[PDB]
Assembly symmetry: C6
Homo-oligomer: 225 residues x 6
């Protein structure tokens, strides 16, 4: 029957989303630079491992595994240990148009590590890396559709350049994803404020509009209203 | 005589449209992501079947039949049963420029299932999937023309980026369709509000402007004013 | 002769007041609007009234909508276009699908001579350039058509598409400049409600009222309220 | 001495321009559709003929001479009589590597033949669009303007624009090549239109600034100088 | 400190804390009729009259004759200065893009007339005359860099379309120039107001923001504020 | 967590909670005349004078001599520092791949034992060779190699609006670890300078815009609480 959700245990998120992220579906998490997209994607995996012993695969296209690990120490998280224990796997897909080969490497890692959670950060970059903007819808669809067939629950980050403009970069990514989460970092009166919005969850309910959040030493904390 | 309408049974819609959707004509349903387009197009067919034993054909370019069926369980509708009974046919037109082949597959399904209601979701995506943005007016016209000839009553969804900008994506879709419905999901003061507007019905009358609506466990509910 | 230009009554309620007597004879009038503003309705009412009131035959040129659907939609208003086609008073010319309008223009001309038409509606010209990806040549080919119609002496309503209520008059930024006369139909959304207005922006060589005038579309077609 | 001006006798305009249009120079008159560009350019020639016996050449790329003549009857002007007397020439440059050289020599032939002091060219936008030559607008508008200055014609050239408060002309270069720039506006506010005329620039001389209201009536253009 | 040369344009030397940086390029950008040509002429004229510093004026469209005629509006006699060899007007109007030939022509004139000041009016136009927009940064950089090597002090005018939009036309010109002056002619409430701003002078100080100015029979007059 | 090196630019080390993250790249973006070059020169000069940390300055347009002359504006003697081998000005102006440039930078960093690197401006070198299609690829290659080398890098970039895109090509901020935005906002005919740390990966900083002034003593930023 109806879609089930997995608790993210990210403070306030499971309230906003009426239970967590839809299982076996993809969630687009989109935001301007420094909005906390990587943090959200890491905290998803980390909580999966710590709260439910669900292994996670982190796919990176630019940042090195070592820097992902190093930056997570800002939040007191020891990702190197989780890697050593085989609970976390960071797949380095950085450079040295068709996503089929990558998709197969990712599927391979999911199977190998028995992963229930996957984060991909950021899919925007791989198309720009290889001047492939003409084929974004088709290739993103290929990736999302395969992850659905595998039954992976996935967070995929993407980039945007305006807080109240396009949801992502090419005006197609939100339509391909099952779920859309928008992180904003709005500048008004010389000051910033962070908000999180669940725009869409296909096949299930969620709270609407923007909710304040903070990034602290404990990662993301969202305040439902 | 003046053009006849078929009831959608979508609460409030047949009020706003003065009796329903014009029979044998095409209706564009456009909106940003997560506005309720797929829901509207599913509810149209589902109601046709349950209320009038009127079979329907659902054309998908991306979402699988399985996920379409799963997401509809959010509302307590059992679409698998209807597929099993031959009352609903979900035509999978996802990938493995001319719409003739697609058109013939749709016609075949209309004649085979004896269907009078057709939903096509989303016609935007198919142009993007084959980079055929330059031929949109010509090919959307071919599609709509042929469905008019066949006598189908058709809901076609399309994608947009702004709540008050272009009706659809390419600036031509609204002019090729006989009828235009716009779903909006406006963000103001950090909160969303859903509205539906019937912009146009050729050859007949309708209520004007935006009417609020909600998506609940019973599908779309529009409040006429 | 040596008088200023004469006008032909549309008999569209209020329009002949706004236009100080109707549409200038032998000239082209652009009627431009977002989707659902009443462009087809205007262009139909122009021919229909010309036939019913003045026995002036009309030619309607369509590039997408079928004759049968044009006829059917006009019954919304209790008009019987089928009857008029039967009597040879209305001809609906189906023009549905380098780039050159010369052939089309000759077919239109042939139709005008054959039916002895005084009034012509072309709906919509926008679409034919989009149907063949011919935006580069719009000014030249639209001029070819308008100039030939003027030469013939036809009184023509040409509809065109726009996508903003207060942006460009038409789609390509040239159409208003090629036509002799320009009418803009708006359907403005404000505070969740729509309102319809009609503006005569320009009539070359003659006077008209200025600004937007409200109008409704009812069972009798377009009804415009002059203000003053 | 500084540049001299010829009177347009368009009511109000010679006050706003501190004397009239600079002699031997090109004046761009730009505006959205129906702002009065053709009317300004006709009235400029008509007044030249009637008040000063200064013959005029009118260059058209789309409107026929017969329609130009017919539309001027709206204002009670008999342009056919002036054509018959050899005082007005309407040069039909309608259609039937883009280069305006031949056009320029047809214009010069007319100027020399009619001993014309005044020239109106309407609209210069249209000829670039007719031949899909937008890429070359600055070079060929400059050729035209330079050649007319060489000939010493005082020229009104009309151009099209899409916004009341946006670009001066169409391609963002026309106002830079012209010596003088006048902007006709027809602003819609509160469902009502108002007409205003602005002299943006006259090279080498002075003029009033900002927008001045005007009306188009049976007597042509009438401009109200505020102060 | 880079040193400055007085423009002697009333108020400008106050706004710029002494004048234009010597041996460097100053971009002067504005919509049509803002006073760009006037500024660049007044710069050369004053250099001659006040300091006997010879000037070269490079035009791509306007003839020398019309430049001279239009300056009579301000009671300046440029013809006399051309005669005396203090002012050279270099007519570069027309009959892969590469400014090298023009640079050599400009360089020749600077040596011959021994010019210390140079005005180029307008560099926008030359790129559009030869549909060469794709290469503006590279070629404007070539021009600025060589003028600097020669040690010329240069005013280069450029065109813009909006009073509060891009500084120039191609979004690169301000970054190539050492110094940037924006002339505005803002329309508000049906009335125009002229203002001058010095956006940037590399390596030295200047006043900030917009200062009102007028164009009169005496040329540009800028009103410094406070 | 990541460590930080003090810039000693007055106010900045407060705003950044300690300085620039060591071994990472910091984008400094701004419209013309915002103080980008000045910031990147003060970074190296303070490094040399206060900590005896050698610096490499990379220029694509401004000559070494003018960089030196312009720094005299602030009482800094850069020619002396170049003479002592404390500062190396790498002239990369002209006479698509950034590999050559990168090997020259690395060589200069080894040779002069530099801890600090400023590159001014990264924008311009892509415009100089019309290589805008390749910005994200090539900026990534430069940033990645400098992270490997462990240099602490300031990279300036150009923008054309105060409240528009962070940089010029919509990708530079996503590739950099850290992002600083200098603004020069015109309002009511007056300019005001502000600095904003938009983002520091892996660590904390103050948010929003802070006023600053450029004086005879360089940049001076006022933190606000
Ligand atoms: N311990 C901490 N306390 C407070 N804020 C922190 C801490 N650690 C990191 N941050 C904040 O988190 C932000 C970094 O977030 P993250 O890398 O997840 O963003 P992003 O959206 O992925 O950026 P980019 O788009 O450039 O990849 C930093 O900019 C910093 O403001
Ligand atoms: N049982 C329910 N109760 C309330 N809301 C629900 C329920 N089920 C789904 N929804 C809402 O319906 C919205 C999604 O609807 P739908 O899939 O029709 O949107 P769409 O316009 O087709 O999206 P896209 O354009 O991305 O395809 C979800 O975003 C969720 O907010
Ligand atoms: N009997 C009626 N009473 C009231 N309004 C009606 C009636 N019949 C039609 N309409 C209105 O007339 C509008 C259709 O007008 P029309 O087809 O002339 O518009 P259009 O501008 O030509 O549309 P498009 O640009 O998409 O071709 C309908 O959208 C409907 O609101
Ligand atoms: N006798 C008159 N009284 C009042 N107004 C008139 C009269 N005759 C013409 N007009 C007005 O003159 C207006 C402007 O005419 P004109 O042809 O000069 O415009 P234009 O700017 O050249 O238009 P386009 O750019 O489309 O060529 C007409 O739209 C009409 O409003
Ligand atoms: N004697 C004068 N008194 C007042 N203003 C004058 C005088 N002479 C010229 N002007 C003004 O100077 C302006 C001409 O300025 P100038 O030619 O320097 O402008 P520009 O910015 O170079 O124009 P463009 O971009 O067309 O080249 C004229 O538009 C006019 O307003
Ligand atoms: N001694 C000083 N006192 C005050 N301001 C100064 C001083 N020296 C330089 N400036 C200011 O510093 C600004 C120059 O800064 P800088 O060269 O660092 O800018 P930038 O952002 O690199 O410019 P561009 O992007 O066009 O290269 C000058 O525009 C000037 O306003
Ligand atoms: Cl925070
Ligand atoms: Cl809802
Ligand atoms: Cl109505
Ligand atoms: Cl009027
Ligand atoms: Cl002034
Ligand atoms: Cl300051
Ligand atoms: Mg990130
Ligand atoms: Mg959908
Ligand atoms: Mg229509
Ligand atoms: Mg005209
Ligand atoms: Mg000038
Ligand atoms: Mg700099």
């Amino acid at each position: 029957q109806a879609i089930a959700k997995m608790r993210t245990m990210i403070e306030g998120f499971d309230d906003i989303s009426h239970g967590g992220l839809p299982i076996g579906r993809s969630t687009l998490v989109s935001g301007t630079s420094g909005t906390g997209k990587t943090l959200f994607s890491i905290q998803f995996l980390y909580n999966g491992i710590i709260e439910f012993d669900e292994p996670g695969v982190f796919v990176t296209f630019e940042e090195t595994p070592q820097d992902i690990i190093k930056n997570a120490r800002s939040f007191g998280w020891d990702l190197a240990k989780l890697v050593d224990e085989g609970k976390l796997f960071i797949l380095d897909a950085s450079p040295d148009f068709d996503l089929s080969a990558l998709i197969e490497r990712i599927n391979y890692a999911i199977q190998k590590y028995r992963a229930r959670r996957v984060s991909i950060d950021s899919v925007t970059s791989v198309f720009q890396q290889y001047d492939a903007s003409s084929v974004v819808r088709r290739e993103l669809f290929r990736l999302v559709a395969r992850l659905k067939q595998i039954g992976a629950t996935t967070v995929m980050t993407t980039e945007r350049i305006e807080e109240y403009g396009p949801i992502a970069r090419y005006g197609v990514e939100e339509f391909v994803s099952d779920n859309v989460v928008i992180l904003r970092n709005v500048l008004e009166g010389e000051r910033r404020r962070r908000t999180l919005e669940i725009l869409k969850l296909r096949g299930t309910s969620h709270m609407k509009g923007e909710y304040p959040f903070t990034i602290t030493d404990h990662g993301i904390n969202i305040f439902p209203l």
